[model samples]
Target: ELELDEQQRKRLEAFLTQKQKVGELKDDDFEKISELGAGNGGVVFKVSHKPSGLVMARKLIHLEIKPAIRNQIIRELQVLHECNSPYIVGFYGAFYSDGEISICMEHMDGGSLDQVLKKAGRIPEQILGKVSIAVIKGLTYLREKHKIMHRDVKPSNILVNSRGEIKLCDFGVSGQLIDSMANSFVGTRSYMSPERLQGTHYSVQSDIWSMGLSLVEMAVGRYPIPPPDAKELELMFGCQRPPMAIFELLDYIVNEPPPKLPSGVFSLEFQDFVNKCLIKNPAERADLKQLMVHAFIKRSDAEEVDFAGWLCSTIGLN
Candidate 1:
């Protein structure tokens, strides 16, 4: 399948050369178990190999516009192929045919954390710390090795395997993202950083801000900044909400101070760590390395919490 012609060479040779190719993964050998989810780029499916009976997530991305999307898929493959971190999702291989690309990745039986959290509105804080720790390390490794921005970091992008180890997925950017420049975010409005929300230069701190919001969401079981009463909205966003639109949420994040866990509900260590990530100013936001030393992270690191068991029980899957 990887008979590189001029166009395929230009379009796909870069990905095929890195680690492994999807050459052996034929389109006919697997059955789609279920539709896992969809992202800006494509629809992902949970599938199983006919012979081996192992599960994999297949992301079938259509090159609706080749330059924008083809390039983006290759970029995602490039990152996933080279990444060795356990906290990052594992890539099997991919095949391109008929203007569509199918990416095979490790299947996380526990599903995305957002879905998991939805089942259990609030989870244990010890587990929250573990989730935070995994995310911090995963983002840090991506920065250290790939020199890339997760760009979109939210609860939905984080997933968990059957063993309870959380992993990061949905790598690289897409064309819709390109469309939303200059305070222009596409689908990640709820967790975008203030700088990104307002249209400006952003970096790891941008992801850190997102991490903060995600942690809060996991702890509280909802988007951290859901719309409030119009009066409260005015006080929060400095105006009436923006007309049943994402602009309302964007306004809240960029203008109002980041919300916090109620006092005395979560420990000071956890609150302080989360607050550091939520620091509205990128300059003040906690960096990945700093988060590693945070008391919450340290506690999580030192403990032996049953990640897999906790997830299955919390979601009533066990």
Candidate 2:
């Protein structure tokens, strides 16, 4: 393993102190871990907390990066410390050993929303509205608190806990998405906003556009940008239009090739909400708080979005 630079090393040390102080985390807290999943930048492992006998999902930063990169990660931990919402994931600070940095978080026994979508045929309107409203609430709090933008908000990032409640995960480290919009394009393809695709200074509204696409994914198990594979996705990303222009383009495209609207059998408000969300213009898209209050989004379900509750109707949870 490569050695950490002086600054990166210091950041890790500071994180350890914070974890000990606030999280009450000690090296002896965890034991007997197993690998869970791996993404482009990180890997998750299923771990057991020795004293409490609690299972956790620990996400570790990937190998081979500059000290600056590591410092950015530590900064992410700091951001996590500032957030507290059931709608977001639980971040219990971090502890490092040698070259690795591990962040302990809540373990989702029911897995991701994408998995649920794959198992079930199509996500019902009431269920999707319920889950999405919770996401909007989380985003509303984030946009208000730190100007933070999740940058990546998709079904995969939404987890289902043991109670079957849907919890948003991995909010911190998202940073000012404007940085990515201005500095360079960043975030997963397929799900990225048009402005982000064109590489311009986007705002909190850019994240709203992402949720619009995510809303579609929840309704129909695929992204609007299509070509799900990363390499192909990267290729399609190159075709993105300028931020301001994309909205006009989307309007034209929508008029030209409007998707087959959901059958009238579905709630009219739900279908209209989808059209409004995917409107392309960040200016035209519904704000997170506004989205939270949409008529189609059930108030009761939003208060407690439980995948198990929905699953109960499907497979007899009772």
Candidate 3:
């Protein structure tokens, strides 16, 4: 009774029209470029198509499906079909092979802004504004078109490339991740809003908080929170179960006065914009429409910051 509907089928056809038209992609078609990054979610790899020499990233989540594998495949399709945004990384398609669901996506040469920061240092406000525009628009597209929320939003997940196209990755898997139960998501918990850490019902505003936090990091070149101690840092990213560091981070986020850009430093407009996002109450927080119209974002429009040039120069991409 639950075969893919005509609508789902049509979306698949349209979605795969990108590369499936070339040929059926077999498991052996790709040669491994080794690991990209691994976490509680799954392991990702950079791979090259054996025949065409084309490069792509593959996120392979090991599957142990006894039955109803089609259900997950169908749901993954649901995210894939609706997501065609330029701000979202392009997913070539997903195919199941040997108890693994291999989801193929574009390889942004410059990598994530987290590493970009390590390489390029702090981002200028103009550059941050441009990044903001992409991130806001991408989040807006997800919410408006697919009615999905990015559970995790951080600099590490915001990937970039030599082309200067900013796209959000590690999203579109909202509920599509099935077996990652218990220790499912592992990300920068410090960026979470109070409501999120407090176990209250939260929404896109939580992401607004995350966006504000990430923007601050971009501007300041480090986490706004006075650095997490060495042990905390190791524990935070380690595969440890809910440890003391986790609780401490959560408490700090929920209890401390919300962070803001220092007064005399950043522009009033930039500071105010972030303040609006950091508002404790979700109701008072700026929404997508307000964010777009905000002076900082509008400034990004007028400046039209030279994103590609700076990015290439920063990452030393020719």
Candidate 4:
């Protein structure tokens, strides 16, 4: 059985009752298998429950950040609690202790789509279509059911498992939609839609833009826009400028012509789908419903793509 002190158990109960999320996993209950990854807000560890022998991804967030960042953590918990879908990573439970919060979630054995792309170089168009379909379905679920906008949709945030399942994870930056629009500027700069960068009231279209960017990155094994070189950064900012941040990238996303997949290599339908997503005008971007039916994603074999097997073969994993 998992061990928990009386105080820890009581606190865990309160959190579970309030959040309505299932399972209770304490920091001491699980043995750390490995450090999965880390980012600005938190760190993820692949952990195994000593008693049950169950494995999960434990995301730990330190509550030492600014108020805004702290609120994001809370929002993520709430959103995750309400989410129940195979296309989204399952949230097992959460615990707060000693100024640190840990959220237990599904463990994706194949890591992230970004990692797969890095190892495999360019993904086949058929497999890419399958990924697109799964992502579009996830986005559709979020919009229709949760009325939420996954503001940050990127290759790194999409996870795949050995069972050929693809799921969307990381909802810290996601925002609830009011009146079918979200006005907050809370997404990754490299993937932000023009309307979001312009501080306009954007909708699911913003996520569509990110999906397009992520797909291109997966297809090419590189970001659409490489980080600006030193001279390029100097021309944009100044001679004695600090290191480039996302703020500099915003200018290019807003002003530069949208990127396109190389011709002849990819099918016209695939290119057309990406073009619709890269549209600068949010109003012109294809909605999730339309995207679901696009020729690129309408194929019958989308579900048959063996993403898990591909990842294993590409990365040399069992």
Candidate 5:
């Protein structure tokens, strides 16, 4: 195992440069297995280190892109460099070879949170709390440790394991919050905050808004409101009102009318925290520290998050 020390930071930095600048990785280094998934920008495959046999998710960017787009790829690597949490997706390292920029990250066996929600209807109350707490805990780490905001928080970005461990990934457009007024309007449409929708300056609180929507989605098993396309999306931007403020409009969601607790799996306090996270005004959203100390989640649940200076180090399959 590659044990990390503070001084090892230099080694990792050098590794990133070699991986990004050259796009080279030895085929012998990693033994490829089955493909896990793919998206518009890259393909994800299951791979493991040669000597250790530790499996991980390896993503390779298509080389047929421009330098501007490639830099954004590097920027994603940079953001990963800053944030490593049990809640956040783990990064292994980058490789630049064969005219491609390959990012090796943690292979989430549980698949996308969206898939889980689709298959399992109205998740058990305890599991709902578990997933919500995990996402918040991860968000807390990202906001505080690096002073960076995710900007985009959604089910597709979330990963759930069989052990109920959740990991957040996909930081392509994320970065440090130089100021509260973030300019780029990124992320999935349905989950975008009001500020992002209007093309205004967004902040970490924007992520809180998304989390709130995610919690509601979990309770109801669908998007709070159907999102618009590129042109329609721009028009909807900056509207202070939620897309579906009217109870009637929101009532018809696919999962429809969120469950009102079966008996007593989750407490009222927990539900209140979820409401607080989804508050309309970004200024009113909860912070990482406050989330860490929320009344609903127990210390044991919080402790499940083992703080890591380097996340990729622990990701390879055992």
Candidate 6:
């Protein structure tokens, strides 16, 4: 006996019946490969569909199935089901069993952009531009079509497949835009826009900040804030322990100047693009529409690399 309300149950049933072709996946249908990770909602596992031998990712949420949490789950499902674009990951289906909800999605062989950054140290500007183009297209889709804001935008949330496809994933924290803005204190702390960290109403521009930060990380190989030689790292984080280090990190993010690409290493267009993203004033930040055509992202000389092929070769996934 599930604890879902009548409305919730009906919605789930309708979604499964209409949108999800593979309804009510059985436990035996999947072979768990490994634990992907955990978030506020639940744990994710890399799994393989036994029938088709197709690999996929599954997010399992253990909840009491109360109305409050059920609504959030449904929201994510609706968003995923509706947001059909190459720049966004594809959703296979969802099911509820034993008070646990499972969502199946396309498995990304490239893991996440976060993993790629860690492995490559820093990616070339041309490749980074292509990545930016993919992400911008995804964000543009979310903002324009559904009026949804992807409250969380970070490297870990961006995925790539072996087919050169880059997709934006993890809609657990996304929300429909109310007058193009939201007041919730959601999203990763590290990538929060200044306005968001300050508890101000935020809009799609907030995600623009996150997009910038992620791009910088991809370009520089680390969080661009606090600068590489800030000296504050050793003083505040050297051996200062847990909560204190966290505080320092937050303080630096809020108080310090926005980070920039190292001069002379990358094109001026690239540096300016990052600057546009890291604008402290949300009102001044470039919107997704503007960023999609930014000189850096749209540079004529930017080389088109097979990102999926590069990822497969880099990680030996192929």
Clashes per model (N, Cα, C within 3 A): 1, 0, 0, 0, 10, 0
Tens digits of per-residue lDDT for model 2, 159-234: 7655555667763332332233234323433655787565446465667666666776766555544214445333
* Residue 111 miss distance in model 3 (angstroms): 0.9
Candidate 4, poorest ten consecutive residues by summed lDDT:
173-182
Give the Cα-based TM-score of candidate 6 against the true structure. Answer: 0.75
Worst 10 residues of 5 by lDDT: 173-182
Clashing pairs in 1: 183-199
Q: What order do candidates take by lDDT, descending?
A: 3, 1, 6, 4, 2, 5
| TM-score per candidate, chains pooled | 0.76, 0.66, 0.77, 0.74, 0.59, 0.75
Error of 3 at 253 (Å): 1.4
Candidate 2 structure lDDT = 0.59
Sort the predicted structures by TM-score, highest score first: 3, 1, 6, 4, 2, 5
What would the per-residue lDDT of candidate 3 be over residues 1-318, giving only the tens digit for each residue? 113457646644664575654455567999998786663457878999787566988877676544444444545454554466667776777766777777777777878888888886678778888888888878877766665344457898788887677888855352455522222334512545676555436467888999998987777677877544456433433421534476777787788767776555568899998989888778999987898999988887678567889999998888
10 residues in a row with least lDDT, candidate 3: 179-188
lDDT of 5 at 32: 84
Clashing pairs in 5: 23-96, 23-97, 24-96, 24-97, 54-317, 55-317, 89-168, 197-237, 198-237, 198-238
Off by over 4 Å in 1: 1-23, 65-76, 79-81, 172-202, 226-244
Compose the digit string of candidate 4's lDDT tens values, residues 35-142: 877734578889987656778888776654334444555555656454555567766776667667777777888887777777787677788887777687777766
lDDT at position 28, candidate 4? 79
**List of clashing residue pairs for candidate 4:** none
Error of 6 at 90 (Å): 0.2
Cand. 3 Cα-lDDT: 0.71
lDDT of 2 at 221: 52
- lDDT by residue (1-318, candidate 5, tens digit) is 113345445545654443444333455688888876664466778887665455777776665434444455456455555344456666666655656667776667777667667666544445556666777767666656654344667776777654445777654421221121133234522555776555436466677767767766666555646533345323333321546566655554434432222123345766666667765556776764566567755632544443221122223222
Choose the strongest candidate by TM-score: 3
The predictions' CA RMSDs to the true structure, in order, are 10.7, 12.4, 10.0, 11.5, 11.8, 10.5
